[PDB]
Design a protein around this ligand. Structure first.
Ligand SMILES: Nc1nc2c(ncn2[C@@H]2O[C@H](COP(=O)(O)OP(=O)(O)O)[C@@H](O)[C@@H]2O)c(=O)[nH]1
Ligand SMILES: Nc1nc2c(ncn2[C@@H]2O[C@H](COP(=O)(O)OP(=O)(O)O)[C@@H](O)[C@H]2O)c(=O)[nH]1
Ligand SMILES: [Mg+2]
Ligand SMILES: [Mg+2]
Lengths: 189, 187
């Protein structure tokens, strides 16, 4: 009916699934994260006419490297997710994710989404980080990464406390608004 | 999950493509052989943890000279191949290959690989060599060059009889085992 496909991507355990399910049901899956890689839909009211926002989840694990890209076709905006309290995923945004996306979808915009920020203050997570890199990604450093990789922008959220969250998706909606007739329509293919 | 990139280089017709295909499939391409712009990813088991061995082929032809190096980055070890029954390929190892490789990848180890050894007796090949060539590169001779050009070592094989072949890659595996002090990764 006038679609907006947004494919979520990011290392594993980064909180991709919880982020979507949280956004869509307004309830963080506090007992079992649905093990199914599913699409989601939300009828957004952009302007005056409704738009179908297609939220697509992905399987991050390496095993899916050769398959994952299959869902990429016709995407409008991407969300490269990384857990604010696991530098691991953050490094991968650069070394793995952004490249993959660009490779397959060169004209498709993408936002850098920091996830699990609520944990930026959970001591045990900090005490665990101890391994010298006992430092959770800060907005300061993530932002530059956005600039370098050319992300439309950096937005961060907590699927647990709902903080930001919706914003991430508004930013996703606004970044995806393809032009009118223009042969320059970033819709991936 | 933990790789070892191995790029094969050598003069055309040296038996590069069959060397790979035969090693990976266990059967010499008896009726078809591509040009290769392909990649083979055998799951090697080093230690206790699996390693993905990336076998990359290259188009040796002069035309590809400025482009072929595009695959060089991320390489752990090199295989400079030359067909034992074609001195031409041999000379090119020193004059062409090692340098090219050296310049591009100054820290990446490489191995001197003699190919098509089984031909070192096919009369026709021999009698054709008659034109100033009573000798197909002997291991001893190649070995010498190995020392000179500082290759990790000289290994030879016959993609046809698969003789030695497997060894070539083991040596390739052992040569590429990057300690964490200095990574010979071609940048
Ligand atoms: N007899 C023999 N010839 C070989 C062997 N491996 C390759 N060849 C010969 O190689 C020719 C082409 O070599 P190829 O592998 O296509 O050379 P490349 O382009 O250097 O990879 C084939 O037509 C031959 O059968 C081998 O071990 N034994
Ligand atoms: N505390 C906290 N845990 C989160 C948050 N978002 C995700 N998780 C957790 O992250 C882990 C994996 O998240 P999932 O959504 O399953 O990650 P995926 O691999 O990216 O789909 C689980 O422990 C979730 O309980 C968040 O904002 N807060
Ligand atoms: Mg998931
Ligand atoms: Mg070839």
């Amino acid at each position: 009916m006038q679609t907006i496909k947004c494919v979520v991507v990011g290392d594993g355990a980064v909180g991709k699934t919880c982020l979507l399910i949280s956004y869509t049901t307004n309830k963080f899956p506090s007992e079992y994260v649905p093990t199914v890689f599913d699409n989601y839909a939300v009828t957004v009211m952009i302007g005056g006419e409704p738009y179908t926002l297609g939220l697509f989840d992905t399987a991050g694990q390496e095993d899916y490297d050769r398959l994952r890209p299959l869902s990429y076709p016709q995407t409008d905006v991407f969300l490269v997710c990384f857990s604010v309290v696991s530098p691991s995923s953050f490094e991968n945004v650069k070394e793995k994710w952004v490249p993959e996306i660009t490779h397959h979808c060169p004209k498709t915009p993408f936002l850098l989404v920091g996830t699990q920020i609520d944990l930026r203050d959970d001591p045990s997570t900090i005490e665990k980080l101890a391994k010298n890199k006992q430092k959770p990604i800060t907005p300061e450093t993530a932002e530059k990464l956005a600039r370098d990789l050319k992300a439309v922008k950096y937005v961060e959220c907590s699927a647990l406390t709902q903080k930001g969250l919706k914003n991430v998706f508004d930013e996703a909606i606004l970044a995806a608004l393809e032009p009118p007739e223009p042969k320059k329509s970033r819709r991936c293919v």
